[PDB]
């Protein structure tokens, strides 16, 4: 049925309107919110536009998924905070809504090109619930320090997408696809999203930090972590390719691993040299992952990651969680170390379980999945112009 | 459509297979101003009977079922019927025979000391059993034995009842405020005037006359030769809304004179919160419900089933004649099942059961009827009109400031227009007019040129005797036997009439497709 997507979108919008009527009531953090907003809707949106025949779907489904996600995440996170009571909408609620949208977009990066918009709406709805429950658990039960959300956002979304793609495994696409190839101007467009993410990541890691020392420490640590990560990503991208060539996938993605891996330790007093070391290790790990672990996952473990979001969010997210554990062990934080370990493990496990359940739901042949031949093609769901 | 398949639920699926393929057309066909004008017409045409019958039911049952319950039931059943029925042009709502049954059942419960609403719940429970069996065995195949004879008799009788009640409301208005030389200037107005008031009945008569006159004038202007054709037809489709607006403004600009307005409930609450709630326990609210009445409700359930079945099926026959250009199909088995099931469900909620009323459905079909360049061209067969009417009836409570400024006299003129426009599709009415015409002026139709004049006049006179008898039945306390007396004309057509009429005369005079035998 071709009417599944508009019907589902209208029903979801009506449900959001009813929930905002039932549960929702009525400024120095606004520029940081705008920076996070620009990240969510431009950086992730254009970062996935590297495919030559899937730019329309990537950017449009990014916008649609994040627009549904901010409302649904607002409702779910507010309900979890207020124990089922009404709550006021401030700037922090909008920031956390954009964070939930970020998690859903990170998951969407894994199954890009092999899913329908209807599947994306369903995955958004389920993933927001799972992510918000995990985030509430980490923030209020374990009370870990994850101000940059290496474990609760990046690792969670990465492993959620990995589980969804593992359930949604296609045997015909395991050896590659003719449409799964980048273009010149498509990579040029992806650099826009890469640059915007890199420029505004300190606000991502310092939006909801405690005002004062912690916020400044988060800003400075994120900035220097990214500065080191860029150089190390370039170096290792040259190292792992033939004749020292630079691979555009590495420059587009791995340059952002420093922000992910410094997220847990952002507000800690790890010093700029420590942040630079973390960013360097993150860039090295991301490049090594893209070079070697992604084909290993695709061919042997039967888990296809379209954008390689594992190498950008999961491995740097786990690195950031372990860095938080070490930094607590070194006295850089007054949190519990066992709580940081529990937060990392619980984030990974909840992501895997929720991804398995959501992928099992999405495998039902009702949502208009593309055929194996038509994967990574805009013409399945969009009116594509005749010329490029 | 009326054939017997021999398969269990065969007629149900056949009606499902007929109309549901056209579902996308049922939404796209409604994007026209004529559908909107039909919605505006049928909104009043279904809300005003709903309000009046809810008031009467609350008065006669001590507000155990009232205006709010009737409005909610109308909205729910109309939405479900427009979204699922195979004849969406039908209008679902409360009717007079249902009110008579409610009065009789309330009297029976009061005499025997039984709980009226719990008895209603049990009767509605018994209704679901009856209609499932009838649809399963294709009990709607017996409708094929109702010819143009019974259809036209029932339609003419129902139109006469509607027009007579419309005039009787004006008579009641005149009697409540008679023309007197002197009046008491100090009369209490809440909740209703306690004495005769000056200029009330005469202004109501003026409003009713103006409404009917302007409705007829704009209907004639639809078929006239003035103005550009598109604008002329747009105005003609919106003739009733324009007449209503003109007369409402006329009444609004007169401030001193009191006129009775529409009254809606304050909010979505039961009429009597001290008697029952939204959900009624089938085991009893105040006292334990007797076991014997659970089984004894079958006979009243049978009577209600006969009433609803005959009313809805004859209405479906009338609104879906081949001569009315209904080229999308109608479902006899599905719609009857839906109507009786929704009635049984609404009985569980303390709300009245509903059936397809003839007058409102025929007006709704005629509102979407497109006349060619005379000759009926096509019908805007779509589901949006009935759904919008149901939604507006449900929302009538929330729009009290608008409905409180509309007089009943304008609605009376609208009812008169509906009654005089409901007689168009009846050949019995046309033959009645031929009783006062010279034989040479009679039209060139098969039932006149092939049958002698006195034979046709005798055929018309026999029908009038049946009409007069049915009028006697209505004006007697045994008015619940009316469907049986209407059924008794089926033996009259198929047994007694052939003894005095030839086969060719019967074929010409009673033709399903208006053919020359």
């Amino acid at each position: 049925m071709r009417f599944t997507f508009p019907l589902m979108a209208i029903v979801l919008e009506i449900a959001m309107i009813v929930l905002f009527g039932l549960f929702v009531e009525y400024f120095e953090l606004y520029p940081l919110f705008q920076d996070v907003h620009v990240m969510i809707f431009v950086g992730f949106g254009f970062l996935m536009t590297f495919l030559k025949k899937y730019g329309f779907s990537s950017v449009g489904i990014n916008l649609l998924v994040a627009a549904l996600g901010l409302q649904w995440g607002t409702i779910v996170q507010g309900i979890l905070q207020s124990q089922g009571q009404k709550f006021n909408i401030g700037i922090k609620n909008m920031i956390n809504a954009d964070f939930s949208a970020a998690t859903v977009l990170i998951s969407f990066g894994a199954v890009l090109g092999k899913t329908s918009p209807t599947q994306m709406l369903i995955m958004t709805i389920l993933e927001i619930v799972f992510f918000a429950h995990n985030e509430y658990l980490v923030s209020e039960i374990f009370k870990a320090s994850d101000i940059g959300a290496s474990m609760t956002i990046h690792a969670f979304g990465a492993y959620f997408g990995l589980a969804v793609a593992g359930i949604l495994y296609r045997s015909g696409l395991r050896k590659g696809h003719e449409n799964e190839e980048s273009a010149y101007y498509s990579d040029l467009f992806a650099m826009i999203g890469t640059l915007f993410l890199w420029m505004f990541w300190p606000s991502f890691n310092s939006a909801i930090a405690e005002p004062g020392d912690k916020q400044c420490r988060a800003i400075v640590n994120t900035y220097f972590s990214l500065a080191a990560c860029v150089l190390t990503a370039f170096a290792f991208s040259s190292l792992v390719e033939h004749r020292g060539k630079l691979n555009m996938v590495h420059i587009q993605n791995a340059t952002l691993a420093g922000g992910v891996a410094v997220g847990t330790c952002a507000d800690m007093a790890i010093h700029p040299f420590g942040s630079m070391i973390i960013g360097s290790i993150a860039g090295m790990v991301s490049v090594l992952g893209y070079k070697f672990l992604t084909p290993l996952f695709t061919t042997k473990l039967r888990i296809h990651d379209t954008c390689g979001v594992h190498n950008l969010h999961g491995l740097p997210g786990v690195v950031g969680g372990l860095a938080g554990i070490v930094a607590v062990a070194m006295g850089a934080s007054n949190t519990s170390m066992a709580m940081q370990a529990a937060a990392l493990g619980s984030s990974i496990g909840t992501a895997v379980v929720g991804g398995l359940m959501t992928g099992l739901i999405l495998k039902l042949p009702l949502w208009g999945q593309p055929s194996d031949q038509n994967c990574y093609d805009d013409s399945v769901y969009w009116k594509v112009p005749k010329t490029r | 459509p009326l054939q017997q398949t021999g398969q269990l639920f065969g007629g149900l699926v056949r009606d499902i297979r007929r109309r549901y393929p056209y579902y996308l057309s049922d939404i796209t066909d409604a994007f026209s101003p004529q559908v909107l004008a039909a919605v505006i017409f049928i909104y009043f045409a279904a809300l005003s009977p709903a309000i009046t019958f809810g008031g009467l039911l609350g008065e006669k049952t001590r507000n155990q079922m009232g205006v709010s319950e009737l409005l909610i039931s109308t909205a729910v059943q109309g939405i479900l019927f427009a979204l699922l029925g195979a004849q969406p042009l039908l209008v679902v709502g409360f009717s007079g025979p249902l009110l008579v049954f409610e009065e009789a059942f309330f009297s029976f419960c009061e005499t025997n000391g039984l709980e009226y609403i719990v008895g209603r719940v049990w009767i509605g429970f018994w209704l679901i059993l009856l209609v499932v069996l009838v649809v399963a065995f294709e009990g709607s195949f017996l409708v094929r034995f109702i010819s143009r004879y019974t259809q036209e008799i029932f339609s003419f009788l129902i139109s006469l009842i509607f027009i007579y009640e419309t005039f009787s409301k004006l008579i009641k208005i005149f009697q409540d405020h008679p023309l007197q030389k002197t009046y008491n200037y100090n009369v209490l107005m809440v909740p209703k005037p306690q004495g005769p008031l000056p200029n009330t009945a005469l202004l109501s008569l003026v409003l009713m006359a103006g409404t009917f006159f302007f409705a007829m004038m704009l209907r004639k202007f639809k078929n006239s030769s003035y103005f550009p054709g598109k604008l002329r037809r747009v105005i003609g489709d919106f003739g009733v809304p324009i007449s209503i607006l003109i007369m409402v403004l006329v009444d609004f600009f007169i401030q001193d004179t009191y006129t009775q307005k529409l009254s809606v409930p304050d909010g979505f609450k039961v009429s009597n919160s001290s008697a029952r709630g939204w959900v009624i326990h089938p085991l009893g609210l105040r006292s334990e419900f007797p076991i014997w009445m659970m089984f004894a409700s079958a006979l009243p359930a049978l009577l209600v089933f006969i009433l609803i079945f005959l009313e809805s099926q004859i209405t479906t026959l009338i609104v879906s004649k081949p001569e009315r250009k209904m080229v999308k199909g109608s479902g006899f088995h599905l719609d009857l099942l839906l109507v009786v099931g929704m009635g049984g469900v609404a009985a569980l909620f303390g709300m009245p059961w509903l059936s397809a009323t003839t007058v409102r459905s025929v007006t709704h079909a005629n509102a979407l009827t497109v006349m060619g360049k005379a000759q009926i061209q096509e019908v805007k067969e779509q589901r949006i009109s009935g759904l919008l009417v149901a939604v507006l009836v449900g929302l009538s409570i929330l729009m009290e400031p608008i409905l409180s400024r509309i007089p009943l006299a304008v609605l009376f003129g609208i009812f008169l227009y509906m009654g005089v426009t409901s007689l168009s599709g009846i050949q019995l009415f046309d033959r009645i007019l031929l009783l006062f015409k010279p034989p040479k002026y009679h039209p060139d139709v098969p039932y006149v040129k092939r049958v002698k004049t006195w034979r046709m006049h005798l055929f018309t006179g026999i029908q009038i005797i049946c009409l007069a008898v049915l009028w006697v039945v209505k004006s007697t306390p045994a008015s619940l036997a009316l469907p049986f007396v209407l059924i008794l004309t089926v033996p009259l057509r198929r047994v007694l009439l052939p003894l005095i009429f030839r086969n060719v005369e019967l074929q010409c005079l009673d033709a399903d497709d208006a053919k020359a035998t």
Binding site: - | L8, G277, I280, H281, P282, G284, S287
Partner: protein, 40 residues
């Protein structure tokens, strides 16, 4: 409900489910009887 109502062993959902089950059983019995007839 409203005001004070007598308390029954079965609640309204329970009693309506029991009544619906009895009705479904009666309908099924009638349908099976009709299926048996017109075959032998």
């Amino acid at each position: 409900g409203e005001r004070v109502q007598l308390a029954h062993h079965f609640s309204e959902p329970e009693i309506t489910l029991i009544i619906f089950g009895v009705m479904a059983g009666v309908i099924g019995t009638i349908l099976l009887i009709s299926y048996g007839i017109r075959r032998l």
